Ligand binder design. Structure first.
Ligand SMILES: Cc1cc2nc3c(=O)[nH]c(=O)nc-3n(C[C@H](O)[C@H](O)[C@H](O)COP(=O)(O)O)c2cc1C
Ligand SMILES: Cc1cc2nc3c(=O)[nH]c(=O)nc-3n(C[C@H](O)[C@H](O)[C@H](O)COP(=O)(O)O)c2cc1C
Ligand SMILES: [Fe+3]
Ligand SMILES: [Fe+3]
Ligand SMILES: [Fe+3]
Ligand SMILES: [Fe+3]
Lengths: 410, 410
């Protein structure tokens, strides 16, 4: 298919793929995304940095062809860089190798085995293992590699185009957005940063300590000031790299708002009434509230709002001695994300209605603790809340909101 | 339920309902909304303006009680205003009347029949039919009524509190947003105006000519300069009324961007490949694209983007001589919304794949014309597009984008 490349610097093009139609990936929702791949034209060698998901290469090849024509060059790739083995960025590597079998493939040591396990036709491909601070010369353009294990896979690495300071960061600093506009400043800031927050919350939270360590290494290497553009593998290219670095710094150190995220499920509406009553009390103190109903809403938006919330409420009715099962999905997600690794133990309350022996709230409190929250109280009641019982929820919310505002903003 | 009112002026409170959990209403999707009701404390009479959806009054009554406490007044309503009979704003009128059976109910003539048909217990209620420019005195505060038939129901009207210039406009100027923040300036502008655009597109488009007439009447009344706050029945209160009046003016006169909305469905992916190829051609001219896949996406977001798009593409495969049935839903919606009433005949193309006698694209072209679009071309092809057939889609998109940019920005 015919598809035009987008120039991002002299001799550097975006040749990625617009996945207009995807609505879910990993455990998170979205309204399309991109698989960003880049073509760098040196005097001697043309380098392709990352590629795209299996079966979506038609756009990529069209843009690569378009870029070579604009450069007056043959349709030829001399160098292949694979920052990350996950298949939304490597899925076309077998195609690329089959068309250019002599082009070396630069990747990390553990990436070789991962790529071969994904794509057995790559066994015997000219892999060239790289380590941090190693560089290849393309002819007037230099690519420098920086290893980034567990950011977000063991195989991950960054590639820096030194002369213009363009950091190809793969997933790091990406956002799941699919626009015709390619750069951060070309879309509304609120959309950009909300998507950055969702991306961090769902993929980077458990790596928060590795983020700070990598930031400390980049600073001591003197490399931070040499980064003028961050070109991630999903979403917008950052012409303001410090904006997203500052965001990651905030998220990794627990900088939160006077904000509470309330999550609940219900069968007959009683736990829902309690959840709304807790919100009224919280709002009476000027503290913000996000309200999620697990019947309708899903984990990826919930954890987005938890990321900059100082407190997290979870409620569910008791059903055969256990909390309603929908909470198990979120709890298992929170056990993997480990929000306590941001440096903050967010406050929490457990609540629900019951009709017999109860116990669901007890379980929720235990799980909220296993997930790294500081549970301050529990409240379980019988069937439909009375007027006074909703006032108790209001009072509990108010007291929580007071504590939220006294917690110092990290 | 305990719930705090929000003061919006001296002696004026928001006593509405936060519908945190609703995700669909009318024919549109949402992430919660509010049912805004307002309490006006005159020296002599307390007036409640609109109310809420049936079964959701607990918050409203809590805020009414709170407002009376803050004013040092009796828990008492002296006057009831019903701007609009639709039940998300009248659902609690039977409750309010049963509690304060002597409080007159001010509404339009045709509203009386509608409210009694909705709520038979209101037969015999102290209705007081009002007409435009009639006023009532609350004791230092005046409410002036302005009829607004078919904005958006025949029964609709606005209520103006003259001394502070607060226009209670019911659905007009509303947006489906559910935040703890009550005012326009307290949330990101992009969210506010995108929600305003969706509300207009889905509810106001066929009334575009009545909007301009009502604007012309308000101006000739010398009344536009007397409006300092627009307090709608959904979403945020406008402290900058001219911002939303300007937006309505643009939408009602066809002011669009260099933007194309593309909608398609597919069974085997061929129509999808065509849609993506049309987008590449459009983007090669710098024209924006929104891409919607009817399997995953729904009508209310589609028509939001059509509202400020200069062109609309629609594609579907042929199935037993007809286009894939999902297009029938959108077409029936566009038949009701009548985008040509904005003063603009948006450009359009019909396309799709076929496997036999075809004819689907023929049908799409006819329906796009019945819906008020200017169909420029059709393109139907056999099974999977070839390389050259995708280039034709690209070329057609490119030529369309040229015409789009030549269309004068109304
Ligand atoms: C977001 C994400 C996080 C992951 N975390 C881990 C991990 O912590 N440990 C691990 O061994 N594999 C991890 N993986 C790798 C998956 O287990 C691996 O890709 C697996 O083959 C996926 O299996 P599937 O095809 O059934 O989805 C992660 C993958 C993703 C996408
Ligand atoms: C957005 C909207 C637009 C409407 N437009 C019309 C209309 O054009 N003509 C009409 O007679 N009724 C119109 N109605 C009224 C509905 O037909 C009426 O409320 C009906 O009783 C709804 O039936 P239902 O309860 O089965 O939804 C409209 C209602 C809504 C919410
Ligand atoms: Fe990844
Ligand atoms: Fe990725
Ligand atoms: Fe309405
Ligand atoms: Fe309404």
């Amino acid at each position: 298919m015919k598809a035009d490349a987008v120039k991002i610097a002299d001799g550097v093009y975006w040749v990625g793929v617009l996945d207009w139609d995807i609505r879910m990936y990993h455990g998170y929702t979205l309204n399309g995304t991109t698989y960003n791949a880049y073509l760098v034209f040196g005097d001697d060698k043309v380098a392709l940095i990352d590629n795209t998901y299996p079966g979506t290469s038609a756009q990529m090849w069209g843009r690569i062809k378009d870029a070579c024509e604009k450069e007056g060059r043959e349709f030829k790739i001399d160098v292949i860089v694979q920052n990350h083995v996950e298949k939304d960025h490597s899925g076309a590597l077998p195609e690329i190798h089959k068309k250019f079998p002599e082009a070396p493939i630069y990747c990390t040591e553990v990436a070789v085995e991962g790529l071969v396990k994904h794509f057995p036709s790559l066994k015997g491909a000219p892999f060239k293992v790289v380590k941090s601070l190693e560089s290849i010369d393309l002819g007037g353009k230099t690519l420098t590699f920086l290893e980034a294990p567990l950011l977000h896979w063991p195989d991950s690495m960054f590639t820096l185009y030194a002369e213009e300071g363009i950091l190809f960061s793969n997933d790091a600093f990406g956002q799941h957005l699919c626009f015709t506009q390619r750069f951060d400043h070309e879309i509304p800031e609120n959309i950009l940063m909300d998507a950055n927050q969702k991306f961090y919350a769902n993929l980077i939270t458990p790596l928060s300590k590795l983020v700070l360590k990598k930031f400390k290494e980049v600073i001591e290497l003197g490399l931070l000031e040499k980064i003028k553009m961050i070109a991630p593998s999903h979403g917008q290219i950052w012409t303001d790299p410090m904006k997203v670095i500052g965001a990651y710094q905030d998220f990794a150190t627990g900088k939160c708002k006077d904000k509470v995220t309330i999550v609940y499920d219900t069968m007959h509406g009683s736990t829902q009434k309690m959840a709304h009553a807790f919100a009224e009390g919280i709002m009476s103190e000027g503290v913000d509230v996000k309200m999620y109903f697990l019947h309708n809403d899903e984990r990826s938006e919930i954890v987005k709002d938890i990321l900059d919330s100082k407190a997290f409420l979870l409620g569910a009715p008791t059903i055969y001695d256990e909390p309603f099962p929908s909470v198990g999905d979120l709890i298992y997600y929170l056990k993997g994300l480990k929000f306590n690794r941001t440096g903050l133990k967010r406050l929490a309350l457990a609540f629900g209605s019951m009709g017999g022996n109860g116990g669901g709230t007890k379980v929720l409190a235990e799980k909220l603790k296993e997930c790294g929250f500081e549970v301050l109280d529990e409240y379980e009641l019988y069937y439909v809340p009375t007027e006074d019982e909703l006032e108790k929820c209001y009072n509990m919310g108010k007291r929580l909101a007071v504590k939220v505002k006294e917690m110092k903003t990290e």
